[PDB]
Symmetry: D2
Subunit: 216 residues, 4 copies
């Protein structure tokens, strides 16, 4: 299960422990009834009893630009392992906005030129980086010229409670657009694996705007 | 997978996400046994603990309250416990064996200590029942139940925090009763993540009993 | 320096505090590249943050409390994980003869076949018998960690609790509420009152825009 | 106290709650005791640190104001047991401020072009990137997009509230040769303020608990 985001990004589901019933079992404290189980999901969610959802956990492999990643990693109730720029020589991959991204703003140049200007500095910066590498500058110093739209990759392990908080904050029109796109992809996977929690979430607890407008 | 502890306790495995290779993927960030075990042993000797956060367990635990109060002090974890405010509580209490007092020289036989603990349990629970029956709400009436009352909780914990738990509780400074629970967590941990557990013991484990 | 007595023998005492309402104003304003301004503008900002659920800034206000409470209240309380605790150890201390004996008024609303005073009395009896067994086992050489297991949940414990304002507001949402047990609500009202004294602007805003409970 | 780091960075102490005795006090509640004596209390600290009792140190808390290159901020903010508020490039027009390494930053590395050329080549892309950034803003491009061309050595600012235990974990990990040299420098300043505010805790830490290398060789 892998969803493309932006121009070269993606959200990929690596693993999952549990399903809707894991939250139910934890709430009841019972190891071993659709309508009743689902009623309980709804009740916990409606009255703010969120601890049982911590028993559902996801691992994602995410590929995203550093400026998105830095917003993402502010979410502390989660586990992250990221590609190190200190030790790995970095790939020529950068997020270059679509002209589509600026259509809607009154600019004094065509958005094609915005794109071309962004692409131009990315190219010079990267070339400078490679010159420094070849000349023997250690990577951890050479990379500091790389712009914030460099794509990085991370594994993120997070429980459903923390994922829902993530959704309230990032699946929302006040969040930067680029991260909204990643949150839609998190939402899709979450919906597929925990359909009851997800619907109860949207109905009772979700505080954002986009997921009630935009299917899955 | 279920391991009985003390007189009426247990630890069972409810679910697990991942295995030794979940740490290996994370540390490499992508997606040969001897290379991969070597990476596990390398992370462990150098204190690179974050990759082990991606293996997660859920256990179902039956434990007396005084053990559970020490256990729940481990904050990097998720718990749901049965509510005494709402469940009529079950005539289940930890009564030590006589062997629990080995090494101690006591005024009365260990067998009389045992008997005295169970007398109190009996009189406490009966007072509790007296109060329920007379219309005292449960949340009030159970305040007289002793600290050896058995409780049950689900516990979800990643392998890093599980290793910290074992460092502190699978050790002879912990109270013996919680050591016994820690031994069981260790045994389940070993079954599910052998390379990680083996490297843990050899390189990072700080306790003595394991 | 603040001390509030709760129940028959408990208390909540403020030991120390870091920061004040302006500590959250300061933390927030760094976002816009700004700092402190005037009384009207900073007040308005604190209200703004609370309405919109920008809670991170309030993490920069921290309290240390010294609390005396029955073990059944302390157990509920220590479930709040985003905090730091150090408690009295039944493994190493000779425990004192102090137990919460509910007053007869605690039973108001409930028709009991035993009058209230006699309930109070039965609770005293059972507690006294437990403590005497406890003492007798200690005196006879039973290790303290073992002898204490006969002591009832209404035994008083003591603890230091360090908690930031954000996590404190979360504690107030859950415990300063009529769905919480009467005994912990009384502790929550003490906590709220100290919070009020020390962070009047944050507290007023919390109450108006974010507080989810009923009793405050 | 404000300590300058790198060419333009700093660590400044905004606030502190508690001191060494805050930990002695929290620790003494286990044994039904309070504060006992101004040399028994120093021994209690050493003792706690010697046997791995870390929780008492949670009751000392610091708030720091830090200015640091993004690449450093990103490493720092990986410490989850802490509270952070950072200057936002979504909502602010960022200032012309970048970490340009000194020529001495490349001591002990054989290079092919001299260290002043390296230093120059970094400035060049920084000046090109900032101009572009300003051109994009001038043209009506929103800040949250324009800033994506700015390099990792752009300076940012944050508040960090952190307890002494977490701060001691930070020091284990960042006041250490394995950590990137730039964040080492930040960890030294943090060490310095911690020592000035909590000398007993700090000395006990270096002696019994600290796992890094640098703070045993580098004074303060
Ligand atoms: C033999 C022994 C006797 C003890 N006696 C006492 C006693 O007298 N009094 C008492 O109160 N408790 C005592 N305990 C409890 C002990 O101090 C801890 O509460 C418990 O072991 C949890 O440890 P922890 O904080 O490492 O685990 P967790 O709470 O699970 O946290 C795990 C890790 O995360 C980090 N962490 C999490 N939260 C914070 C935070 N807020 N600040 C900084 N770092 C954080 C730490 O690095 C920690 O190692 C005792 C434990 C044992 C084994
Ligand atoms: C009226 C009521 C009845 C209840 N009955 C039960 C019961 O029957 N059984 C039972 O076990 N408990 C019950 N509780 C306890 C309850 O489940 C919580 O433990 C308690 O309210 C602590 O809340 P918290 O987790 O939000 O606070 P903390 O644990 O401090 O967490 C604060 C916030 O941090 C976040 N957080 C912290 N850690 C994690 C994590 N690991 N994953 C995701 N998010 C995290 C959450 O956003 C949370 O709101 C009851 C509580 C109340 C108020
Ligand atoms: C020299 C070195 C090189 C590194 N290179 C890499 C790299 O290649 N890739 C990469 O992604 N990062 C790397 N880092 C970052 C590292 O993986 C950690 O995220 C960071 O150092 C914070 O460490 P911490 O988890 O101890 O701190 P915090 O996240 O503040 O946690 C502090 C303590 O709390 C406990 N704790 C907190 N949260 C959890 C949790 N969710 N589960 C279990 N225990 C918890 C632990 O006991 C820990 O000791 C590097 C760090 C250094 C120092
Ligand atoms: C539109 C928007 C703009 C923002 N702009 C800014 C900016 O200008 N500057 C900036 O620095 N950041 C900003 N952020 C980041 C934001 O401040 C949070 O750090 C981020 O949203 C993560 O939120 P969280 O703390 O709820 O998540 P997590 O850190 O995963 O915490 C999850 C839950 O745990 C609890 N919790 C966890 N740790 C603690 C703790 N140490 N103390 C108390 N409670 C805790 C809380 O209940 C919280 O809901 C922005 C976020 C968004 C969505
Ligand atoms: O929408 C936002 C705005 C800010 N931040 C956090 C991430 C960084 O730590 C810091 C600056 O983010 P930018 O404004 O530079 O994206 O605040 C977010 O997480 N989300
Ligand atoms: O010494 C290091 C190396 C990496 N990281 C973390 C920070 C980022 O989230 C990610 C990659 O950092 P760089 O290696 O790119 O600096 O891992 C550190 O915290 N410290
Ligand atoms: O109102 C409640 C009920 C339960 N619990 C938690 C605390 C204990 O860890 C466990 C059992 O609480 P009692 O219902 O037994 O009080 O569930 C609470 O925090 N509050
Ligand atoms: O070995 C211990 C001793 C104490 N505590 C914590 C749990 C309680 O919150 C408090 C007192 O526990 P007892 O000493 O009463 O078991 O300190 C532990 O976690 N482990």
């Amino acid at each position: 299960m892998k969803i493309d985001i932006l121009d070269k990004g993606f959200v990929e589901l690596v693993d999952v422990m549990g399903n809707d019933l894991s939250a139910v079992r934890a709430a009841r404290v019972s190891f071993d009834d659709e309508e009743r189980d689902r009623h309980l999901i709804e009740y916990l969610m409606k009255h703010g009893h969120e601890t049982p959802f911590e028993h559902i956990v996801f691992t994602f492999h995410v590929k995203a630009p550093i400026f998105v990643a830095r917003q993402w990693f502010r979410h502390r109730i989660a586990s992250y392992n990221e590609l190190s720029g200190r030790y790995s020589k970095l790939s020529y991959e950068f997020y270059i906005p679509s002209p589509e991204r600026l259509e809607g703003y009154k600019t004094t140049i065509p958005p094609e030129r915005v794109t071309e200007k962004i692409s131009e500095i990315v190219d010079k910066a990267y070339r400078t980086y490679l010159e420094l590498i070849e000349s023997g500058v250690p990577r951890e110093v050479a990379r500091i010229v790389l712009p914030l739209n460099l794509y990085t990759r991370a594994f993120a392990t997070v429980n459903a409670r923390s994922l829902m908080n993530f959704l309230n904050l990032r699946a929302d029109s006040h969040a930067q657009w680029e991260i909204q796109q990643y949150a839609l992809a998190i939402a899709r996977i979450f919906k597929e694996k925990c359909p009851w929690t997800f619907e109860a979430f949207l109905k009772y607890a979700y505080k954002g705007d986009i997921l009630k407008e935009v299917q899955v």
